[PDB]
What does this fold into?
Amino acid sequence: KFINTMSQVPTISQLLPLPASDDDDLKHKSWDYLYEPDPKALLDTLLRRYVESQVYQ
Amino acid sequence: NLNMDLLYMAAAVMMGLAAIGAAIGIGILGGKFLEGAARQPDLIPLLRTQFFIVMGLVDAIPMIAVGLGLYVMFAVA
Amino acid sequence: NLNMDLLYMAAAVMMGLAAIGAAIGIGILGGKFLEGAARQPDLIPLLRTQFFIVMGLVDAIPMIAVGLGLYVMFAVA
Amino acid sequence: NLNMDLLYMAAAVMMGLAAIGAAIGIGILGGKFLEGAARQPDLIPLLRTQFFIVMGLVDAIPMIAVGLGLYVMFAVA
It folds into this structure.
């Protein structure tokens, strides 16, 4: 982890199963998506792309 | 006389049809209210509000027909 | 005689049909309005405006038929 | 009893129509309730509350239909 130009630290961090984010469901009720075709198929690819993005980062 | 024999049928139809109409109309209108609620709960007060607002306009003609049917079945007959 | 009662049978059929029509039509319309609202409650007033604009068009013919029910039951009589 | 045989057809028309209307209305509403539940089982009791809340409206006419049809079947006839 490139903390600062003078200090880097090895970290082992979990990416599956997905860490509990600092997020609250209360904000969600404002609106919802029109899922095309349906959410169960989208969520899969979202999680796969997300894990790929974190390995890249 | 012959009047007793037709009016109790005419009113019967005049109100069974309004029954069909109001029943199916409200079933359909409430189905979307339930699906919306299950989709986004806590909006339930607002959904219920504007549901009742709309529903009031669905009953108009069915209830008019019910009223006139009764006005016949007794006050005419 | 029949020249009285069959007028009531005609009134019954006309108003029953008009009732089923208006009720089910507005039920469908309102159902789609409801789910449209549920997906984003912050549009509600605009959707309601267009909802009324259309629900007017729905009623034009049924409200003719309903009135003709009265023209039959109280002018042809 | 030509007069009487038309009454036992009148009750039949009234309550047959009421049967179809109420049955299909409740079928639709309960179907939407069921899919809502299957989405969110831990909402099931609140959605049952709402299902019973609205279902009382689908019966508004079809019971009146029984209220008069059966009355005629057993107080007028």
Chain D has three helices and no strands. Chain D touches chain B through 49 residues (CB under 8 Å). Chain D has one domain: 1-77.
